[PDB]
Each structure stands twice: as C-alpha cells, then as structure tokens.
Design an enzyme around this catalytic site. Structure first.
Site, mmCIF file in Angstrom:
data_model
loop_
_atom_site.group_PDB
_atom_site.id
_atom_site.type_symbol
_atom_site.label_atom_id
_atom_site.label_comp_id
_atom_site.label_asym_id
_atom_site.label_seq_id
_atom_site.Cartn_x
_atom_site.Cartn_y
_atom_site.Cartn_z
ATOM 1 N N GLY A 195 -38.512 -13.517 -1.871
ATOM 2 C CA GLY A 195 -39.041 -14.864 -1.805
ATOM 3 C C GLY A 195 -40.142 -15.107 -2.812
ATOM 4 O O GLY A 195 -41.287 -15.350 -2.431
ATOM 5 N N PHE A 198 -42.588 -16.880 -5.225
ATOM 6 C CA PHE A 198 -43.251 -18.178 -5.106
ATOM 7 C C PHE A 198 -43.046 -18.822 -3.737
ATOM 8 O O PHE A 198 -42.884 -20.035 -3.643
ATOM 9 C CB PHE A 198 -42.764 -19.145 -6.192
ATOM 10 C CG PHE A 198 -43.571 -19.102 -7.452
ATOM 11 C CD1 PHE A 198 -44.834 -19.666 -7.495
ATOM 12 C CD2 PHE A 198 -43.065 -18.510 -8.596
ATOM 13 C CE1 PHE A 198 -45.581 -19.634 -8.653
ATOM 14 C CE2 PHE A 198 -43.807 -18.474 -9.756
ATOM 15 C CZ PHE A 198 -45.067 -19.035 -9.786
ATOM 16 N N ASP A 246 -36.188 -12.293 -12.734
ATOM 17 C CA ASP A 246 -36.298 -11.663 -11.418
ATOM 18 C C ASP A 246 -34.975 -11.093 -10.904
ATOM 19 O O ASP A 246 -34.853 -10.810 -9.713
ATOM 20 C CB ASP A 246 -36.853 -12.663 -10.389
ATOM 21 C CG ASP A 246 -38.338 -12.947 -10.581
ATOM 22 O OD1 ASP A 246 -39.166 -12.053 -10.291
ATOM 23 O OD2 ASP A 246 -38.680 -14.075 -10.998
#
Ligand SMILES: CCCS(=O)(=O)Nc1ccc(F)c(C(=O)c2c[nH]c3ncc(-c4ccc(Cl)cc4)cc23)c1F
Length: 261
Positions: A18, A20, A128
């Site tokens: 998760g 941010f 990411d």
C-alpha cells in the site's frame, strides 16, 4: 468529475500497504479495492495535484492493468479500483500452498510483461514493481497495481536495481530499472522463493547489491523451467541498465517461448 459522492464507498477487510496509503477490501455493492491515502488535512494545492494524477488514471486503461473506477475526497482521499479475488502473486508464492504449474507460471509472466509494456507505452515508470503489486483476478487475469502517483523505497529492496539502491541520482528510476524488478518477479515465479534467502541483514544486501557482488541465484530455478526463460531472466538482472532488454523485446521472446513448449 470522477469523484464518488460521500458515503457511497465503505471499507472492510484490511490488506495492508500500500504505497502512499493503506489498501482495503472495500465495497459499493460489488467488491472494490480502496486505497486510503495517508493525508490528514488536504490543502487545495495537493488536492489539485491528486486531481491531476487521477486525470491520468482516467485514460490509462489496459487488460493487465488495474481498472481505475474513481476517487474520493470526503471523508478521506481514497483510490478505488477493482478487486482481485485471487489475491496477490506474493501471497500465492510465499504465503500459501498452491500447486503452480510451469504452464501458468510463464503465462503470469507474459501478462505482467504486457501490462508493463503498456505502461511504458504510456511513458509511465512503475518504480514499485514486485510480486506484492501483481494481483490475480478471479478470471485468471494478472492485474498490475501501485503504479499510480507517478509524478509524486519502503520497504522492499529485493526488487531494486543496483543503480537504484546506491543511490547517486535524485531520480535513479528509469524504464530499465522497471525491467530489473520484472527480472526478480521472474525469479520468484521460477524458483518459488524470494531472492537472498541466505542473507538476513538488510544493511548488507544494500551494500552488496549496490557493490555488484551479490546477484540472484539462478541455480534455484525449477528443473521444468525452459532454458530460454532462464537466460532471459539473466539479461533482466544484469547490473548495467544499458544492457537490459526493453519490454517490447521481453514480451516478444516470452510469448514466442510459450508456443515452443
Ligand atoms: C489504477 C491503479 C491505482 S494504484 O494506486 O496505482 N494501485 C492500487 C490502488 C488501490 C488498491 F486498492 C490497490 C491494491 O493494492 C489492490 C487493488 N486490488 C486488489 N486486490 C487484491 C489485493 C490483495 C488481496 C489479497 C491479498 Cl493477501 C493481497 C492483496 C490487493 C489489491 C492498488 F494496487
């Protein structure tokens, strides 16, 4: 505006993080995933900044890309996407017992590559990419997430490129560093393990991967793994970002490999 009116969205089962924010199995009569952004008191400035990046998620639409359904302001800034019943790829590989045949192992890799190929076609760097952000939809379709808020590190360094780790530039991320992260995803699929199981120190992995003296052990891949897949994986894991293959030729050799076997 794409803004979902207040009250229409409700959260339930917490998944975790998760980037941010914090993700939940949310709901509005139809299971959706809600990312509760960690923003306490939204100033009209960052509210507009979030508005503009939402405007990006509007037209970034692909089959292997998480479908953006809408956003929220009141009571809290939230990103609403579709829910994948088959959880994430990290969960099936490292957190549960699931008989994964090489047949669909490669297929998961093929769908992930095409999803990333589209993102790079839209000039978006993921930054990411890991098996945590690869979600398996119930219709046996791979969905890529956590690519949002591109124009705006913790705490997964296993998928980080050697040049990203050091770091030297304020913006070390590139299209080529996404490829390395994909190379680790390939490693997880074939071996069934996270890299560097032997080493425990996070500080030591930082030093050694950046140094270039520590690389994923390609020896631990399963025996039924095609040889073309293995050295392709090796090319994605090369230190110099210059020598790494682009996703167009990644997607090309994978999909042509699937029809050989
Ligand atoms: C358009 C994309 C917007 S984004 O900000 O860039 N990305 C973005 C935005 C909101 C999210 F809520 C998520 C997210 O994480 C998930 C989205 N659908 C899911 N389904 C299952 C699981 C899951 C279920 C079970 C386990 Cl055990 C683990 C994970 C996790 C998610 C996300 F990746």
């Amino acid at each position: 505006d794409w803004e979902i009116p207040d009250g229409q969205i409700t959260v339930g089962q917490r998944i975790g993080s998760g980037s941010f924010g914090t993700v939940y199995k949310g709901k509005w009569h139809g299971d959706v995933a809600v990312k509760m952004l960690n923003v306490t008191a939204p100033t009209p400035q960052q509210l507009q900044a979030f508005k503009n990046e939402v405007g990006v998620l509007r037209k970034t639409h692909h089959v292997n890309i998480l479908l953006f359904m809408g956003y929220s302001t009141k009571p809290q800034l939230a990103i609403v996407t579709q829910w994948c019943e088959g959880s994430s790829l990290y969960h099936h590989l490292h957190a549960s017992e699931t008989k994964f045949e090489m047949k669909k192992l490669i297929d998961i890799a093929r769908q992930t590559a095409r999803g990333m190929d589209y993102l790079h076609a839209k000039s978006i760097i993921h930054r990411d990419l890991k098996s945590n952000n690869i979600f398996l939809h119930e219709d046996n379709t791979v969905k890529i997430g956590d690519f949002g808020l591109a124009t705006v590190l913790s705490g997964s360094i296993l998928w980080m490129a050697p040049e990203v780790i050091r770091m030297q530039d304020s913006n070390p991320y590139s299209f080529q560093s996404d490829v390395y992260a994909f190379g680790i995803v390939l490693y997880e699929l074939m071996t069934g393990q996270l890299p560097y199981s032997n080493i425990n120190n996070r500080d030591q992995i930082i030093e050694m991967v950046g140094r270039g003296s520590l690389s994923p052990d390609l020896s631990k891949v399963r025996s039924n793994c095609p040889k073309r897949m293995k050295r392709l994986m090796a090319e994605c894991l090369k230190k110099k970002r210059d020598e790494r293959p682009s996703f167009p030729r990644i997607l090309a050799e994978i999909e042509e490999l699937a029809r050989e076997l």
